[PDB]
Amino acid sequence: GPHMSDHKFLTQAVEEAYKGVDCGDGGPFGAVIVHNNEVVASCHNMVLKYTDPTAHAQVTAIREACKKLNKIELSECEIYASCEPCPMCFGAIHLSRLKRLVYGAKAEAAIAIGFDDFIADALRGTGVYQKSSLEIKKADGNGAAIAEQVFQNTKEKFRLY
Amino acid sequence: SDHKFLTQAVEEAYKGVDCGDGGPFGAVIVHNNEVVASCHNMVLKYTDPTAHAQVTAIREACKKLNKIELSECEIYASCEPCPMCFGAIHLSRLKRLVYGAKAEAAIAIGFDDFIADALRGTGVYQKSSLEIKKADGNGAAIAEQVFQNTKEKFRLY
Ligand SMILES: Nc1nc2c(ncn2[C@@H]2O[C@H](CO)[C@@H](O)[C@H]2O)c(=O)[nH]1
Ligand SMILES: Nc1nc2c(ncn2[C@@H]2O[C@H](CO)[C@@H](O)[C@H]2O)c(=O)[nH]1
Ligand SMILES: [Zn+2]
Ligand SMILES: [Zn+2]
């Protein structure tokens, strides 16, 4: 059920992170968008491949899912992010109308290997103007440990962008 | 020079509304008074809810200059950038933002109450360093007028 599906899709997002950093497409971040347990898009960060600083894993997955589904609203879909989404990605998640976000690692795990200290107030509940009502789940247990370890494991395979 | 490029971003907003590409928003990225990108919202054309004017402009500028950072460049936005767009402006390292209309002008004709704390100075976890100018006088009047003039010329998203 939900738990098994959640763990499977977060694991897919983590594997995308490893795949993308391995082939030089971008940093170690993956995202999977699912429609009633059917995968619509499975993507990783493409900033280096695309020369596009907006091509984070989550944005790339939204772009792909919307193109595939022929609609700009992903209201029947959920997104699994290997790492907590940044302010841009969390904004994109809002604009796409995704109904639920599950993420694996806290942003601090990426910041620990040198990524920008760039965290979404609306995800953490700390804004004045931007407020979220999106359903948000932070992974726990085995899936969370596997997600957090990505950054220490991939430190030397890529250069920070 | 600020009025010229703000006015070009507003012209883009009108053109994109007129051809059905997206909503009434445009953005212009410049390097030392040379236009590097001139775009409008492409959400409807591209079937892409991330294709706001500012994101589109960033993608096109990064392609034109063949690099992922625009630290020598400034962005002119016909309307206050949203949390997504202002985050993209942060990631692209643009050094200055000039924007025409406050978000309230767009909210007034039906867009989401969807405002970037970091732009307004109320971020906790997100703190901006880039220089931000809200237009005044004629530039503000032109930019606010977009929303009254385009009111029912496009589909909301
Ligand atoms: N979750 C995620 N974070 C990214 C990505 N690319 C860069 N980062 C950075 O990693 C940190 C944690 O999200 C922030 O500085 C992000 O901007 C991406 O594709 N996905
Ligand atoms: N500045 C700007 N706002 C947009 C655009 N598309 C939709 N909006 C919405 O307009 C409001 C003010 O930025 C927010 O709800 C935005 O999400 C765009 O392309 N540019
Ligand atoms: Zn991001
Ligand atoms: Zn925007």
Side-chain angles (χ1 to χ4, degrees), chain A residues 86-96 130, chain B residues 82-84 114:
Chain A
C86 78
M88 171 187 71
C89 289
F90 194 75
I93 284 170
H94 169 79
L95 286 165
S96 74
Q130 190 190 352
Chain B
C82 79
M84 179 187 63
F114 181 48

Side-chain angles (χ1 to χ4, degrees), chain A residues 50-54 56 63 66 71-72 87-88 91 94-95 97 116 118-119 121 124 126-130, chain B residues 47-50 52 55 59 62-63 67-68 83-84 87 90-91 112 114-115 117 120 122 124-126 157:
Chain A
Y50 291 173
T51 313
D52 176 2
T54 74
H56 282 192
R63 289 163 176 172
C66 291
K71 52 175 31 178
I72 67 173
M88 171 187 71
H94 169 79
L95 286 165
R97 319 293 182 203
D116 193 12
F118 180 51
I119 293 171
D121 289 284
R124 292 205 175 186
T126 59
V128 165
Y129 288 98
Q130 190 190 352
Chain B
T47 314
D48 174 5
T50 74
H52 285 192
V55 169
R59 293 177 70 189
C62 286
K63 269 294 165 184
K67 57 180 175 131
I68 58 164
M84 179 187 63
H90 174 83
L91 292 165
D112 287 348
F114 181 48
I115 290 173
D117 287 279
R120 296 212 174 182
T122 53
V124 174
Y125 274 112
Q126 187 190 352
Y157 54 89

